[PDB]
Paper text:
In the salivary glands of the fly, the pathogen adopts the metacyclic form and expresses a limited repertoire of VSG genes specific to that developmental stage. The VSG protein can be roughly divided into three functional units: the signal peptide for delivery to the cell surface (and which is cleaved during translocation), a large N-terminal domain (NTD) that forms the bulk of the molecule, and the smaller C-terminal domain (CTD) that is tethered to the NTD by a flexible linker that can often be removed by endogenous and exogenous proteases.
Consistent with bioinformatic analyses, mVSG531 is very similar to the structures of other Class A2 members solved from BSF VSGs, particularly VSG1 and VSG2, aligning to each with a RMSD of 2.1Å over 354 residues and 2.4Å over 347 residues, respectively. The positions of the two cysteine disulfides bonds in the top lobe of the N-terminal domain closely overlap with several of those in structures of bloodstream Class A2 members, although this does not hold for all Class A members, such as A3 member VSG13 and Class A1 mVSG397 and VSGsur. The N-linked sugars of VSG1, VSG2, and mVSG531 are located in very similar positions in the lower lobe as well. Two disulfide bonds are observed at the top lobe of each molecule (green spheres).
Residue numbers in the entry:
A (entry chain B): 29 to 314, 325 to 398
B (entry chain A): 29 to 315, 325 to 399
């Protein structure tokens, strides 16, 4: 018999999903912050190499330093372009996930609170057992957080919707008299919200004009005397039919998320002669032979020696009006690094003019 | 008499608001993109001034170039820090705005589609006139887009919720038998969804346990024989009471939105000797106001315009850093290209220094 509440095998998974959506924005924020940290790491590595070269013009490693500054600049530009390419996709995943969560929280809340006396709209396995909150704020043992927690950059698993599509939900069933999604109405227990018709639902004198999409289209409330009908799995996924656009758009948004470990953001690692962007830098500022001669190595790590020299270079108190000695590898603001490059570039200009005056 | 649909003076404004929320993400995207563009412009201006000094060691503007490079570096760091501080606020505004829109669209759709025969849940001015979609997809003359448009970085006004709070909605009314939010039920026309009670609503045998927040708390569906109760304006804003957290949290996020033309992102203006970060740059790389005036040869508001124009108009000939064509330095606008030019000329400086020292060797 029609007219009872919604079985937990249906809404339970929806509760778990909306609870996962709560943390999607914080996970995306964390990924954006980590991407920006890599780009800034490249930009600062460029300046440190440039500072070391300006500080030690007569260094025997000028060719290696010229290659490294040009390489880190390309890495900074390539990382910056990848971030701009990923930014619309990140925004939309935040937008689409929270929009779906708002749909689910509105209707889940309405059903959960439509409880009292005969009214039992979220039930477990039968018409008489209504869901209640436990001390741990679980709803009949399920996570069901129907609001947004404060934004925090921490990862949060999203397992009910992935690049592969939706999972762990019920599909297809209902839409008639089989009591597949609601238990048989055995007596006084009822939930008139789940049918848009007058016999066992909230319709007055008859049904509405046509079935109604709820849960952003995951479920249809019928305009006839019939229990709700669950959408097909493919209706919730990219390429599916109509009726659940918010689900498909979120799947698509998740499919198109950028890779946080993309090659465009990360230092190149191969043998120095195989490193494509090392070679391009050497080609433009000084190919293979030039790279390997500047670093005195064909190995995978022939750059570690000059890299360590840059990091450990001592910047004495008073250099660029600095208040204490520090290692160049620990200076990590653009203001400080830019002032050091300017200080040494100015010194070099005065060295050039003085030597040229002596020679003339 | 209780039991009719919802008056358009209530849902009309909610339809207009949810239509505005559709474009919030794109406006936020546009602002972030424009902010990143300013930061990148500072970084590239630093590189051009540094390239010009390296290319022209014998310039008479060496002190001015050292000041500008250090200044543009401070600007790039100051803009980057401002963007990183604004990024959580941007994410939350996107998250909170779309989350509220999802709430409003779910319930609006349910009421709009609960139409047919006696069922009339969104009405205009009386119990018998149900709202319908026109040719332009307006709902009884109102914009009511219950879905998200494709994301576009385009301006989109959000006027119903601002830094000052919410506006243009009805507040306070309802919660009993006065028919302030529903018209009096004259006959067969009905909407049982709007009261969680059995006399004129969808309750079975009695009311539910407690009033129910709908429209994310903008309105309460009553557990007693009573029409819905609209929240007070202050309950929808930062610092308000309970019942509409999704509204207060969106107001807060909007209050904390970043300024796209913030001082931290833009060039300093005015007399050179009064530009705080020009003065700080000069102090640190030269060892204040007097050093700045001497470097640029002026105290006017536009004392830096002469060296800035020299940088922009400097010719970079084909073959410099393996470049394939002549170009003005002010038109070179990638970090790869500018970084290869600075590297090329820094190397030239090293070789110029070594050659001069060997020539001069005693
Ligand atoms: C592409 O490749 C370049 C070159 O490798 C790289 O640039 C380098 O970036 C790092 C920053 O990412 C620069 O700074 C180094 O950063 C590490 C990590 O710092 C973080 O983590 C530590 C530990 O939790 C925190 O304390 C710190 O706050 C940060 O969160 C630091 O550990 C480094 O400090 C060491 O080196 C200093 C300079 O010599 C030392 O004085 C300091 O004590 C540390 O000593 C290290 O080396 C010692 C000698 O072997 C060893 O005994 C110690 O145990 C320790 O290992 C340093 O601050 C670094 O300067 C950059 N290098 C150059 C040449 O620019 C880019 O990051 C990379 N790009 C990407 C995107 O990955």
């Amino acid at each position: 018999v029609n007219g009872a509440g919604l079985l937990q095998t249906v809404w339970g998974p929806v509760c778990e999903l909306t609870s996962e959506l709560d943390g999607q924005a914080g996970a995306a924020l964390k990924k954006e912050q980590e991407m920006l940290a890599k780009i800034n790491d490249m930009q600062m590595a460029q300046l440190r190499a440039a500072i070391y070269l300006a500080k030690n013009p007569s260094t025997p490693h000028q060719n290696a330093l010229a290659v490294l500054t040009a390489y880190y600049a390309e890495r900074a530009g390539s990382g910056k372009a990848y971030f701009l390419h990923a930014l619309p996709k990140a925004v939309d995943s935040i937008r689409r996930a929270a929009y779906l969560k708002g749909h689910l929280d509105e209707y889940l809340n309405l059903l959960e609170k439509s409880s009292g006396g005969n009214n039992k709209c979220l039930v477990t396995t039968d018409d008489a057992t209504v869901a209640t909150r436990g001390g741990d704020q679980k709803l009949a043992g399920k996570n069901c957080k129907l609001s947004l927690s404060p934004l925090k950059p921490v990862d949060a698993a999203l397992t009910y919707i992935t690049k592969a599509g939706v999972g762990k939900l019920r599909y297809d069933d209902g839409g008639a008299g089989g009591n597949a999604v609601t238990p048989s109405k055995s007596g006084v227990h009822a939930c008139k919200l789940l049918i848009a018709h007058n016999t066992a639902g909230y319709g007055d004198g008859g049904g509405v004009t046509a079935d109604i999409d709820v849960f952003a289209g995951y479920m249809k409330v019928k305009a006839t005397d019939a229990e709700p009908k669950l959408a097909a799995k493919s209706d919730l996924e990219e390429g599916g039919g109509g009726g659940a656009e918010a689900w498909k758009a979120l799947h698509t948004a998740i499919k198109q998320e950028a890779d946080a470990e993309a090659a465009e953001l990360t230092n190149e690692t191969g043998k120095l002669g195989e490193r494509r962007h090392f070679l391009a830098a050497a080609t433009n500022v000084l190919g293979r032979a030039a790279v390997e001669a500047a670093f005195g190595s064909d190995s995978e790590g022939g750059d570690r020696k000059i890299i360590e020299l840059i990091e450990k270079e001592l910047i004495v108190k008073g250099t660029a009006n600095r208040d204490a000695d520090e290692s160049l590898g620990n200076i990590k603001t653009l203001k400080e690094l830019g002032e050091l490059l300017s200080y040494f570039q100015l010194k070099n200009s005065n060295t050039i003019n003085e030597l040229r005056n002596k020679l003339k």
